[model samples]
Target: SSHHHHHHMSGENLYFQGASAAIVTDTGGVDDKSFNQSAWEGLQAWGKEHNLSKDNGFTYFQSTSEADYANNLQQAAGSYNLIFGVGFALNNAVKDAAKEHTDLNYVLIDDVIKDQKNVASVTFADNESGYLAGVAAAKTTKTKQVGFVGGIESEVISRFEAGFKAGVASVDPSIKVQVDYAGSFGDAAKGKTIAAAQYAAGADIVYQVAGGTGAGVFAEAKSLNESRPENEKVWVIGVDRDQEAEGKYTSKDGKESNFVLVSTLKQVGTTVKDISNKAERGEFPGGQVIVYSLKDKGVDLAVTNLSEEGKKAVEDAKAKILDGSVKVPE
Candidate 1:
């Protein structure tokens, strides 16, 4: 309970204003059970790790709507040491805000906002992450067919697609890999429709990169696999977070379990927390951009499918990516 009241300020114009970071999200704000949650977790951990003063510690803002992006940054304009725009949707909002508040520092995750010099741009080698997922697809596909889905199609998401194709090829050169985009990041219905089409075409496994829309991909995989004939297996590969937990299903008898192939993970938590810590140590990569890959554990894969190969693959991939033996599409 001490933590509950330990570090909150009680008055305005206190001796120290918080070193707040505004995290603007296009998805469902702070508790989306996904990216937003990871980023917020990073902020909380970064604050605690440094023992920042209650009144002068690090903080954040959760934007619920697209329009709130700019306004959120302006609210923390010159107040926080660094402001973070959480998703691709906040690109313009951050660009404009940073220009207006030139003195304040900012970090834009997953999108490039170069209109200001006091900014650090963070990104993931989604293509590399996806490539490993592709490798999983190669090893698991019974029909020699695997599929990829994106909530929206952009260069960022395409990187995932490209690397996925590459990864699948790495394991089996002749396997057929199909890629599709769901157009919008929020439409689960559309995601379901597209997923159904893919399944109908004989896909054995599907990997999702569509934020909330990817929920439909999971739904489709679960519903179709539940009533299979004498011998059939289907799985959904998760993304962003260790989503093996989200795909759990309860049988009629109340026992809970489900199928998962694996997950391509983005190290959102460590990345954000690393930035905060870096800033505290005067190592902020201001005006510089970097992409996290397997080497730095910035992005990796989750081995929730309960397999020896999957586990070994991750360890081997880490070594190869770090040591330059394996290369995922940039």
Candidate 2:
């Protein structure tokens, strides 16, 4: 409750000014139940761990649209000791702002800008996470049919597709891995339509890599399960967050089952906290482009509903990935 009372201020004459660090979220907002939300959780934990007041430790600025990206960064650059751009969508804004404000330290997650002395860019091997998710999906599917839904065909997201398909093939080459894209990350309606089509085609499990659009995948899975027998119910996989809890479901008889299959996690929140700690301790790795992988704990898979066999497969695959025996496509 004490955390709820902190006063938030805005650009120039900010009331909650002079924080040590601040994050600028993309248009996903601070509570997308996904990437931006996780990053904010990390920052909040960082602040509380240091026993710093909300006004003096850290704060965040939310971008309602692409136009707000540069504006939010410009505002935080004036006050916070460190500023973070939370997604790839903020790449250009972070580049321009980091170049313009040499005094402020910047950390850009999910994308890279120039080698500015004030900026540290962080990237992840999400393909590894996807591969593990695929293994889980393959092992769990009774119909031998699974699906993948992506928001965009960007290089980063493409890795998810490649690795996921490969992982599925590794488990059972005969398993059909259906793939589709929504063209954008924010359109939940499009996500629902695409996922519904896959389920209709006998895909009992679906994985969504779309940001807000993934929410619709969960919704559609839930709706489809209402009339179906439990054995024939559909499951959805979440990306970027541990979405098992987000997919909590209940039946008319009070029977409960999480609608989510698993999540190919990009530990954006943990990475945010790690970097923020570095900045606070004067160990910030500025001017560097950092790459993260499963070996480095940067990418992972949530094992919420994973079977024992699935867990063993993941561990074996993980060892191969770590030892370079298995090369997941990027």
Candidate 3:
């Protein structure tokens, strides 16, 4: 009867105007167009709509070094009413920042930051998206095996792994999920190399969450498909944005280059946008974490991208998952 207490939903704006903010990104900058692009677009769009200068709406900070995290917080703290440390890299930095500046509002994307009063950490149910990709892989596979690639090994990437495994498991327990961690979101060549090996292992569809490294994953997928059509029944799954068009050409980040099957996205941009807006409204959601599931419209899988077979697979799989007929990996 009382939905008010938990009524925070998407398109629910509780933000104000004229709030200065700072946005910090991990590894890649705003132009990456893969992971960081969405977040940048969100804030930039927000600023333009409200006539806030980039400097006024938010300060854009790139991470030359992970060592810059604390200092970045210090830099943002001075001028911004709100600051968002983007991506999974800020988990630790956020924990430290929230404690030091109890009044500062912060939103950490793609990972969890614990025990902070002045923070709104955003995490998506990536499993749902990855699960759809897995279903696509299972349906598209002529070779019967799929692969998953990640920029690094962490909870952020593990969600992809778990969901892929669970999805493949749903299709047929025999489909193996080969996982490779690039150790950095900074390199695309490394991602490509890993994907090549997975392709060689009889995986027809490869899904990558390897940050800049994912550029390589798509490069490998595309080149292999071009050079060896018979051996290249493989496709690549993209992450961070709607990557349906990622593989049309090569990319600098090298994560989801040409041959993109589809993307499992996390809206880093809208999250930053909404938070920035909230700060302006003096309705800071800090000291509060925003968790998005299918119900919240924060995290959603792409139903429109599925193939005919992919559609049936998802229809059945999703019903079970939503109705609790099937369970995601623990």
Candidate 2 lands at a TM-score of 0.90
Candidate 3 residue-wise lDDT, 82-147, digit = tens: 788888778888788878888777888877666666778788887876776777778767777788
In order, the Cα lDDT scores of the candidates are: 0.74, 0.85, 0.75
RMSD of 2: 8.3
Candidate 3 deviant stretches above 4 angstroms: 1-17, 228-233, 249-258, 303-305
Supply the TM-score for candidate 1: 0.83
Model 2, residue 294: C-alpha shift (Å): 0.9
Q: Between the candidate structures 1 and 3, which one is better when assessed by TM-score?
A: 3
- lDDT of candidate 2 at residue 127, scale 0 to 100: 88
Q: TM-scores of the models, in the given order?
A: 0.83, 0.90, 0.86
All-Cα superposition RMSD per candidate: 7.3, 8.3, 6.6
Q: Assess the local accuracy of residue 72 in candidate 3 as a C-alpha lDDT between 0 and 100.
A: 83
Per-residue lDDT of candidate 2, residues 111-150 (tens digit): 8877688999999998899999888899899889999998
Q: Which sequence of candidate numbers ranks them by lDDT, best first?
A: 2, 3, 1
